[PDB]
């Protein structure tokens, strides 16, 4: 039936041999004949649910049912690029005599993750190269190598 | 004839191929030159066709 194809067209993403068909998102008002696709908060609150299927230290897997691509993608992009953390920016060097170059060492120390909780700190203002208790932390690395 | 841990006290790489000189600090390489074989009869055509 053609109604079967209309229902597959707005609810499934088939995978052919040569290309994935039905890739877009279509349930908008006026796109279909007898269907009403205008915004309805009750239908969204009735169909949405979250199933957490696995969680341990430093990993999480869960399901979201009922949300669309343009919001799950927003959540992925916020988790990649807009959730703040604490990381090293300034490295002040006193007597680096290692073979590792100072720029390369600063770049390596930049990428170490820090266990500070970033809900407690504020942004350092424009300039203000010292920084105070409110908006910075400060580690000290000092290693000297000798013979056994 | 040295071992790789004795290239260390000469500040030299073991994998440096050599074959080059050191003249006033720069490293110069005498390239392989290609010549014609001497003492051989060459039968050739002139510009005039002869």
């Amino acid at each position: 039936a053609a109604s079967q194809a209309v229902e597959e067209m707005r609810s499934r993403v088939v995978l052919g041999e040569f290309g994935v068909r039905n890739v877009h998102t279509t349930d908008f008002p006026g796109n279909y004949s007898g269907y009403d696709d205008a915004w309805d908060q009750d239908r969204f609150e009735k169909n949405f649910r979250v199933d957490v299927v696995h969680m341990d230290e430093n990993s999480l897997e869960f399901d979201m049912v009922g949300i669309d691509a343009a919001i799950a993608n927003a959540f992925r992009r916020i988790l990649l690029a807009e959730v703040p953390t604490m990381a090293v920016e300034k490295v002040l060097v006193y007597n680096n005599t290692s073979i590792v170059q100072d720029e390369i060492l600063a770049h390596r120390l930049g990428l170490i993750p820090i266990h500070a909780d970033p809900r407690l700190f504020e942004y350092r203002n424009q300039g203000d190269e010292e920084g105070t208790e409110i908006d910075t932390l400060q580690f000290r690395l000092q290693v000297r190598c000798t013979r056994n | 004839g040295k071992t790789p841990a004795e290239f260390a006290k000469l500040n030299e790489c073991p994998l440096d191929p050599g074959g080059y000189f050191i003249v006033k600090g720069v490293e110069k390489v005498i390239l392989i030159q290609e010549q014609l074989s001497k003492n051989r009869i060459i039968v050739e055509a002139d510009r005039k066709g002869a």
């Binding site: 053609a2 194809a5 209309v6 067209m9 008002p29 006026g30 796109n31 | -």
Partner: protein, 148 residues
């Protein structure tokens, strides 16, 4: 009514040169009441058409059967009774080439009419008395529903 043309057709061929496309099929039809052959491109994903089918094809100048030519911009959202409720497949396109037939050298009456539905063509060839009202640069509605 703003009907240009109406006859029951009958499918004679589906793919003459093969399956060149995935969603479009170049139908070849022929009527009962007159001798009208009908080249047509339909969308066989949303609306499957088989080999021996028999559908009723109305071409209307307007979609509201009160004869009002009010089409400034088509609103798909609005729900008011139109001509389309009695038909399963409706397209919208423009007549762009009325062309004389070159088969006969004297005393001929067959005229071709080409309607392009944004890329999906339709030749409607037959007697000149049936094609009255087809003008170039005129926008028409194709309407179509299968029969038993």
């Amino acid at each position: 009514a703003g009907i240009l043309f109406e006859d029951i057709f009958d499918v004679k061929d589906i793919d003459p040169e093969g399956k060149k496309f995935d969603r479009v099929s170049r139908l070849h039809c022929e009527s009962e009441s007159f001798k009208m052959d009908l080249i047509l491109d339909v969308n066989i994903q949303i609306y499957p058409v088989d080999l021996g089918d028999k559908f009723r094809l109305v071409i209307a100048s307007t979609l509201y059967e009160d004869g009002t030519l009010d089409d400034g911009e088509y609103n798909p959202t609005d729900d008011r009774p139109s001509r389309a409720d009695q038909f399963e497949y409706v397209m919208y396109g423009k007549v762009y080439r009325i062309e004389g037939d070159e088969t006969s050298t004297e005393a001929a009456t067959r005229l071709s009419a080409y309607v392009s539905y944004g890329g999906l063509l339709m030749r409607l060839q037959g007697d000149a008395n049936n094609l009255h009202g087809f003008e170039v640069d005129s926008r028409v509605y194709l309407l179509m529903k299968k029969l038993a």
